[PDB]
Design a protein around this ligand. Structure first.
Ligand SMILES: [Mg+2]
Ligand SMILES: [Zn+2]
Ligand SMILES: [Zn+2]
Ligand SMILES: [Zn+2]
Lengths: 66, 54, 60, 96, 89, 116, 528, 189
C-alpha cells in the first residue's frame, strides 16, 4: 500500500502536454502521466515507439561512419 | 528489539486489561487515564505480556 | 487474485460473482479487502502480532 | 444529524499505517454491527425464534451446532442480496 | 411523537409562533398534528415544523395564506445576526 | 462435551459417594449455604441410600473381577459390587442387558469375591 | 464461544434449497390494504418480516428494528433462463451431445485433459484457458463419439434466445428455437463424471440449476418502503418489479389453465422472461430497461452491487461513522505540532468512554457533578450491569455518589486526548494523523502551520474532519503509530515532509543574515 | 451410571482473577461454565474435580482476557438405555411412576410396571392391586430395567427416563424375595 500511494501521489503533480518540441536531435514521445499509464498498463504497442541504438566501437566516434 | 506494531499491541492489551479491572503493577499519579497508565508501565519496563515469533 | 470478493469489489462485480458461482470458487479470506468486508482484523501491521502472558501476575 | 463520510481512501491510509484495530473500530462499532446465528453444518444463516426462545436452522433442520457470529450489518445485507439471486454463499466457521 | 414541553414555549393558541420571539435549535415554529397511522388508532401524529437542529435566531415575520387548493399555508422566516468570527471567509 | 474429550473411567456409586462428600466439605468450609450444589445433594441422597459397601474394597473387588476373567469390563465389575446378588436369577437379570450371560460356577466364584 | 468466518464457498441455489429456506409462498400482487396493514399473501406479507412500527413478525416475533427478515419464493409457471448464466448455457450446449448428454470428446482425450486439469486448476486464468480449449475442441464435431447421432449447430441471440439450425426436407434449415424447458431437459441429463471438463463442479452447482423454476424473494427489511411527506407509500423498485413478476406469472397460470392459444402462451412466456431478466439486471445488453412512473430507469439487484454508490464501494469499503466532526481550519502557531485546537462546542458533543478505576475515581466523580453543561462534564453513565443513564440536572449528585468501580462514564473531551485528524482527498498515508486535543473557545479547528504540507492544506476555506477512537486498543494504536512527530520523514523519498514554510524561512534568513543585530530587550523577549 | 472422565478445554480467565493462581481460577470458571449441565453424549455433568494442567494465555484482540487450554477430570452420571436402576420412587402419577435415578428422575409408566392389568391407586394414589395385590410404596427402593431415555436439553429438564419392571428380576425387594422363594421351592421339588 505504501508503494502504491508513493507512486500515485506524485501523479497529481505531473503535466499532460509534455514538451512537443523537436530540437533536431530529439524525437517527440509521450511523457508525463500518459507515459506512466502506458507503462503500468503495459500496452502491447506504445503510442510513440522509439529505440536507442548504440553503435559498436567502429563508427561510434566518427560522425560520417555513424 | 520490539517493532512498533508489537509495542502498540502490547500497550493496547495492557490498557484494556487495566480498564477492565486488572491491578496496576506500578504506582501512578492520581487522575491519570488507563492508556497513560499502560504507557507508564511500559516505559518503566514492567510488562507481563510477551510476543510469539516463529 | 484468488479471492472472489477482492476482484468483485474492484470492477465488473456481477460477472465475477456469476463466474465464481459457476466454478464453485472458494474464498479463504486471506487478504485485506475481504477481511475489511467481514469486519475482522486484517493480517497486516498490528493485525498479525500474537501475544501470550504468564497468568499468576502479582503486583509489585 | 448525519455522519461524515469515511471514504475507502481513508481505509487504505489506515491500512498503510498498519493500524488494524483502529480500522476495525472505525468500520464496525461506529457505523453498523450485529450478531447472527450460523449453522456450521450447511453454512446457511439460522433462524432465532423469539416465541420459543429457540434457535434452529430451517434449510437443514440443525439445532446442535449453531454458533454465534459477529459481522457488519451491511455484509448481512450483501449476503441477502446475493441469496436474492441464485447465488449460494456457504459460510465456513473457525474457532479463535 | 410529542416532544418536550420546553419546545412549545413560544407558540400562540392558534398554533403559530409570535414574531420577534427568539428561538433555538429544534424549537417548534408551527404546531401541527396529522391523522394517525395504522401501525396507532385514536391518535394524532405530531408533525410540527421546527428550527433546523444547529440554527438559532429570532422570528422575523409570519405569513398565513391559502394554497391553490384552499388549504392553509404558513411561512415563517427566522433572522440571525452574524458578527464576523474566526473561520469566516 | 467440551472440545476434545479424551479418557473415560467407570466407578461405583460408593466410589463417588466419598467424592460427593468431599464437595460437601469444601463447599461448607467455603460457607456456601448448600452443602453441595443442585443435582449433587440429591445424588448424595441416592449414593447414601445404599453406600454401605466400602468404596476402596469395591475397587478391590472390581480388580479381582478383572483378574478372574478377561471378558469383564470395569463397569460390569462395579455394577456387580453395587448390586450384591443372592441367587442365580439376580445375575441372569443384571446381565440380561449385556450381550453375555454369566455362568453359574461364575456365580459361585463372584460370590466369594463379593464377601460382605 | 464466539466463532469467526474462516472461508466462504460460493455456488448455485437449488430449487429444493430455495423451497426449504423460504418462509412463505407469494400469490397476491399487492403490498398494503386500504388502512395500511400488509395484505395476507402479498409481496409485503408479515412472514418475511415487519418494517412498519407496532407489528410483530409471526415467523420470529421481533419488532421493526429487531426482526432481521426472512426469504420468500415464487413458483414460476414455466422455467426461464437466468440472464447471468445465459452465455455459460450457450457454452455448455454446443459442447455436449443432444441425445446422451455426454461431452462430445473422445475417451483418451478426456483422460489427457483430466490429467491436465488436475495440474493446479486453482489458477483461474489457466483453468479458463483449458476450458476454452475444450470448448473449441467440442465445437467442431458434428457427430457424438460416444453415441451415434448427428449434432446441429446452435446460435445464441442475446440476451437469452437460443436457435437450433436443424436441417429439414429438400436440405433446408429452419432455425428451430429452443424453449427453456427443452434446454433444461437437455442440461439435466449431463453426467457428473465430466462436469469438471466443462468448468463446473458436481456439488456446488449443476447445469440444470442455471435454468430456474422457483425465484427467491428478498426479505422485507431489504426492501424498505418510504412513507413520503405527502402521506403516500413510496415503494422500492425491487418491490414494484416483484409485483409485476407475480402479475405476469398469475396471468400465465390462468391462461395455461384456460387452454389459451399457443401464440398467447409463447408471448406471455417471453414477457415473463423479460421481466425476470430485468429484475435480475436492468442494464443487461440487448433489452430496453424498465422505467419508473416518472420515466427514470429502475434500479434492480445488479445495480445495487455496482458503481461508486453501490453496496461494495458505498457501504462496505467505506461508510459514514459516528463520533466525527467537521469544520473549517484556521492557523495557530502557538500550539505544538502534535496538537489540534478543538472548539468547546465540539468537545461537549463528542465523548470518550472511560472506565472507573482506583486511580481516576475522583476526577470522574467531579465531571459527573459538573453535568452535561459545564465544559469538563459528562453526558452518560453506564452501570456495570450495562444500563445507560443520561446525566441530567436532577441526577448529578445521586449518580456521582452511585459511581463506583466498574462503571463507565462518557466524559467530555480533555486536554491530552488523542483524535484522528484528516483531510480529503486522502492521497497518501500521512493524510491522516493523530493529534493531542487542546480545547479552544471559538468554532474552528486550530492546526499548527508546520503540519500543513502533509495535509496539503491552506486556510482559504478548507474543511478537515476529526475522528475520536472509542476503545482503548484503538487509542493505543493512534497514540503509538500515528503520532505526528513520528512522521517527520516522508516514506516516499526519505526526506522531511514536516518543516518550516514561507514566513519561517523568511524570518530565519532575516535573523541569520549578515549584519543582523539585536538589543537586550529584543533578545530576552524573543527567547522567552 | 457414575463415571469419571477427563476432557481438555479452553478457559476464559477474566482480568479480575489475574492475581490469583491459574489453577483455582480455572476451577471456578469451569464450575460456572458447566456445573449444572447434562450432556447428550456424556450425561449430567456433576463436578470438575481438579484441573490437571493449565497452559498459557493467548491475548485475543478485542476481549483483552487470557484464554488458557486446560485438561481436567469430571465425574458424570451417565444414564444408559436397557439398564437396571436401583432407585426409589420419588412420586407417582397415573400415567407413570417417577423413580429418582440420579440428577434426573426416571419415569415408570403404569402400563409398564407389572404383567397384571394396568392399575394405579386413586385414593392413596400409589398403586392398587387388581389380581397380584402387589403394593409399591413411595419410600421403598426398587430396581428397574430401562426402556428409553429422553435426551432433550442440557438444563436437566424435560428429560425423563423410561424404566420397565415387567421383566423378571426387578421390583420391590419384598416381591423379589417372593420370587426367590418360588425359585427355591421349584429347585427343591
Ligand atoms: Mg485550500
Ligand atoms: Zn443448517
Ligand atoms: Zn422475522
Ligand atoms: Zn451422444
Amino acid at each position: 500500500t505504501v508503494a502504491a500511494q508513493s507512486i500515485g501521489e506524485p501523479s497529481t503533480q505531473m503535466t499532460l502536454n509534455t514538451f512537443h518540441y523537436a530540437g533536431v536531435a530529439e524525437i517527440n514521445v509521450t511523457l508525463g502521466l500518459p507515459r506512466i499509464i502506458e507503462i503500468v498498463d503495459a500496452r502491447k504497442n506504445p503510442s510513440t515507439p522509439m529505440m536507442t541504438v548504440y553503435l559498436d566501437e567502429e563508427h561510434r566516434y566518427d560522425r560520417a561512419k555513424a | 528489539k520490539y517493532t512498533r506494531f508489537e509495542k502498540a499491541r502490547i500497550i493496547g492489551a495492557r490498557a484494556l486489561q487495566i480498564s477492565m479491572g486488572a491491578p496496576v503493577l506500578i504506582d501512578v499519579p492520581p487522575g491519570i487515564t488507563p492508556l497513560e497508565a499502560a504507557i507508564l508501565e511500559f516505559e518503566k519496563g514492567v510488562i507481563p505480556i510477551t510476543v510469539i515469533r516463529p | 487474485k484468488s479471492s472472489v470478493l477482492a476482484r468483485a469489489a474492484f470492477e465488473i462485480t456481477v460477472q465475477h460473482l456469476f463466474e465464481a458461482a459457476e466454478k464453485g470458487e472458494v474464498d479463504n479470506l486471506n487478504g485485506v479487502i475481504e477481511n475489511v468486508l467481514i469486519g475482522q482484523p486484517v493480517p497486516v501491521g498490528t493485525g498479525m502480532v500474537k501475544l501470550t502472558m504468564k497468568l499468576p501476575l502479582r503486583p509489585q | 444529524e448525519g455522519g461524515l463520510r469515511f471514504g475507502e481512501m481513508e481505509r487504505d491510509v489506515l491500512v498503510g499505517h498498519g493500524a488494524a484495530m483502529l480500522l476495525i473500530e472505525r468500520l464496525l462499532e461506529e457505523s453498523d454491527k450485529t450478531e447472527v446465528w450460523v449453522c456450521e453444518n450447511c453454512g446457511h444463516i439460522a433462524l432465532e425464534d423469539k416465541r420459543r426462545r429457540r434457535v434452529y436452522c430451517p434449510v437443514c433442520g440443525e439445532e446442535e451446532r449453531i454458533s454465534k457470529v459477529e459481522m457488519s450489518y451491511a455484509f448481512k445485507l450483501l449476503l441477502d442480496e446475493l441469496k436474492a439471486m441464485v447465488i449460494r454463499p456457504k459460510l465456513n466457521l473457525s474457532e479463535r | 411523537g410529542y416532544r418536550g414541553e420546553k419546545y412549545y414555549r413560544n407558540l400562540d393558541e392558534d398554533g403559530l409562533i409570535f414574531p420577534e420571539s427568539k428561538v433555538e435549535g429544534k424549537d417548534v415554529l408551527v404546531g401541527r398534528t396529522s391523522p394517525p397511522r395504522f401501525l396507532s388508532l385514536q391518535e394524532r401524529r405530531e408533525t410540527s415544523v421546527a428550527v433546523r437542529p444547529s440554527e438559532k435566531g429570532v422570528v422575523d415575520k409570519v405569513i398565513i395564506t391559502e394554497t391553490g387548493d384552499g388549504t392553509k399555508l404558513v411561512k415563517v422566516t427566522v433572522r440571525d445576526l452574524r458578527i464576523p468570527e474566526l473561520g469566516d471567509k | 462435551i467440551g472440545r476434545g474429550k479424551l479418557g473415560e473411567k467407570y466407578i461405583t456409586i460408593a466410589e463417588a459417594k466419598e467424592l460427593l462428600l468431599k464437595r460437601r466439605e469444601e463447599e461448607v468450609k467455603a460457607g456456601i449455604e448448600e452443602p453441595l450444589y443442585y443435582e449433587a445433594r440429591l445424588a448424595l441422597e441416592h449414593a447414601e441410600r445404599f453406600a454401605k459397601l466400602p468404596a476402596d474394597k469395591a475397587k478391590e473387588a472390581v480388580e479381582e473381577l478383572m483378574n478372574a476373567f478377561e471378558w469383564m469390563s470395569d463397569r460390569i465389575a462395579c455394577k456387580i459390587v453395587d448390586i450384591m446378588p443372592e441367587d442365580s436369577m439376580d445375575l441372569r437379570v443384571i446381565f440380561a442387558k449385556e450381550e453375555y450371560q454369566p455362568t453359574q460356577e461364575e456365580m459361585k466364584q463372584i460370590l466369594d469375591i463379593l464377601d460382605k | 464461544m464466539k466463532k469467526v468466518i474462516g472461508s466462504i464457498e460460493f455456488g448455485i441455489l437449488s430449487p429444493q434449497e430455495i423451497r426449504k429456506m423460504s418462509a412463505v409462498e407469494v400469490t397476491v400482487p399487492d403490498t398494503y390494504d386500504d388502512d395500511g396493514y400488509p395484505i395476507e399473501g402479498g409481496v409485503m406479507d408479515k412472514r418475511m418480516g415487519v418494517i412498519d412500527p407496532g407489528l410483530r413478525c409471526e415467523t420470529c416475533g421481533g419488532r421493526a428494528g429487531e426482526c432481521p427478515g426472512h426469504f420468500g419464493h415464487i413458483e414460476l409457471a414455466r422455467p426461464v433462463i437466468h440472464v447471468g448464466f445465459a452465455k455459460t448455457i450457450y457454452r455448455i450446449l454446443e459442447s455436449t451431445c443432444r441425445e446422451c448428454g455426454r461431452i462430445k470428446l473422445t475417451d483418451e482425450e478426456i483422460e489427457e485433459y483430466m490429467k491436465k486439469i488436475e495440474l493446479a486448476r486453482n489458477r483461474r486464468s489457466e483453468f479458463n484457458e483449458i476450458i476454452k480449449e475444450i470448448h473449441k475442441k467440442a465445437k467442431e464435431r458434428m457427430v457424438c463419439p460416444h453415441c451415434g447421432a448427428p449434432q446441429y449447430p446452435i446460435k445464441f441471440e442475446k440476451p437469452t434466445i437460443y436457435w437450433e439450425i436443424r436441417k429439414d426436407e429438400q436440405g433446408n434449415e429452419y432455425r428451430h428455437r429452443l424453449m427453456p424447458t427443452e434446454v433444461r431437459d437437455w442440461l439435466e441429463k449431463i453426467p457428473d463424471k465430466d462436469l469438471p471438463l466443462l468448468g463446473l463442479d458436481p456439488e456446488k452447482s449443476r447445469p440444470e440449476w442455471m435454468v430456474l423454476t422457483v425465484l427467491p424473494v428478498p426479505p422485507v427489511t431489504a426492501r424498505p418502503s418510504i412513507t413520503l411527506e405527502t402521506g403516500i407509500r413510496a415503494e422500492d423498485d425491487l418491490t414494484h418489479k416483484l409485483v409485476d413478476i407475480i402479475r405476469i406469472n398469475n396471468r400465465l397460470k390462468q391462461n395455461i389453465e384456460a387452454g389459451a392459444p399457443q401464440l398467447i402462451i409463447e408471448d406471455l412466456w417471453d414477457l415473463l422472461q423479460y421481466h425476470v431478466t430485468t429484475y435480475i439486471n436492468n442494464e443487461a445488453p440487448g433489452v430496453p430497461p424498465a422505467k419508473h412512473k416518472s420515466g427514470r430507469p429502475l434500479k434492480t439487484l445488479a445495480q445495487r452491487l455496482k458503481g461508486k454508490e453501490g453496496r461494495f464501494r458505498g457501504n462496505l469499503s467505506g461508510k459514514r461513522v459516528n463520533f466525527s466532526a467537521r469544520t473549517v481550519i484556521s492557523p495557530d502557531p502557538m500550539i505544538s505540532i502534535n496538537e489540534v485546537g478543538v472548539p468547546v462546542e465540539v468537545a461537549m458533543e463528542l465523548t470518550v468512554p472511560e472506565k472507573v478505576t482506583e486511580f481516576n475515581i475522583e476526577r470522574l466523580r467531579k465531571m459527573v457533578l459538573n453535568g452535561p453543561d459545564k465544559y469538563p462534564g459528562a453526558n452518560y453513565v453506564i452501570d456495570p450491569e450495562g444500563r445507560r443513564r443520561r446525566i441530567m440536572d436532577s441526577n448529578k449528585e445521586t449518580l456521582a455518589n452511585q459511581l463506583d468501580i466498574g462503571w463507565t462514564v462518557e466524559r467530555h473531551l480533555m486536554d491530552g486526548d488523542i483524535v484522528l485528524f484528516n483531510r480529503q482527498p486522502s492521497l497518501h498515508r500521512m493524510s491522516i494523523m493523530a493529534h493531542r486535543v487542546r480545547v479552544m473557545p471559538y468554532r474552528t479547528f486550530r492546526l499548527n502551520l508546520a503540519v500543513c504540507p502533509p495535509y496539503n492544506a491552506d486556510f482559504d476555506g478548507d474543511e478537515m474532519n476529526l475522528h475520536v477512537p472509542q476503545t482503548e486498543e484503538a487509542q493505543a494504536e493512534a497514540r503509538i503509530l500515528m503520532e505526528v512527530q513520528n512522521h517527520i520523514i516522508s516514506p516516499r523519498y526519505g526526506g522531511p515532509i514536516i518543516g518550516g514554510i514561507q514566513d519561517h524561512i523568511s524570518g530565519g534568513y532575516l535573523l541569520t543574515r549578515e549584519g543582523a543585530y539585536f538589543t537586550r530587550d529584543e533578545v530576552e523577549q524573543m527567547l522567552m | 451410571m457414575y463415571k469419571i472422565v477427563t476432557v481438555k478445554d479452553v478457559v476464559r480467565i477474566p482480568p479480575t482473577m489475574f492475581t490469583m493462581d491459574p489453577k483455582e481460577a480455572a476451577k471456578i470458571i469451569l464450575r460456572e461454565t458447566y456445573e449444572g449441565t447434562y450432556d447428550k453424549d456424556e450425561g449430567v455433568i456433576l463436578s470438575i474435580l481438579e484441573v490437571k494442567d493449565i497452559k498459557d494465555g493467548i491475548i485475543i484482540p478485542g476481549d483483552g482476557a487470557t484464554y488458557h487450554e486446560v485438561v481436567f477430570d469430571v465425574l458424570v452420571w451417565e444414564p444408559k438405555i436397557h439398564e437396571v436402576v436401583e432407585g426409589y420412587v420419588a412420586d407417582v402419577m397415573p400415567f407413570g411412576a417417577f423413580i429418582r435415578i440420579g440428577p434426573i428422575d426416571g419415569l415408570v409408566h403404569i402400563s409398564q410396571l407389572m404383567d397384571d392389568y394396568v392399575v394405579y391407586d386413586e385414593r392413596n394414589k400409589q398403586f392398587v392391586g387388581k389380581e397380584k395385590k402387589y403394593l409399591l410404596k413411595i419410600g421403598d427402593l426398587v430396581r428397574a430395567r430401562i426402556i428409553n431415555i429422553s435426551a432433550k436439553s442440557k438444563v436437566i429438564r424435560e428429560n425423563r427416563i423410561g424404566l420397565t419392571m415387567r421383566q423378571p428380576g426387578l421390583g420391590k425387594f419384598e416381591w423379589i424375595e417372593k420370587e426367590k422363594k418360588k425359585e427355591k421351592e421349584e429347585g427343591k421339588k
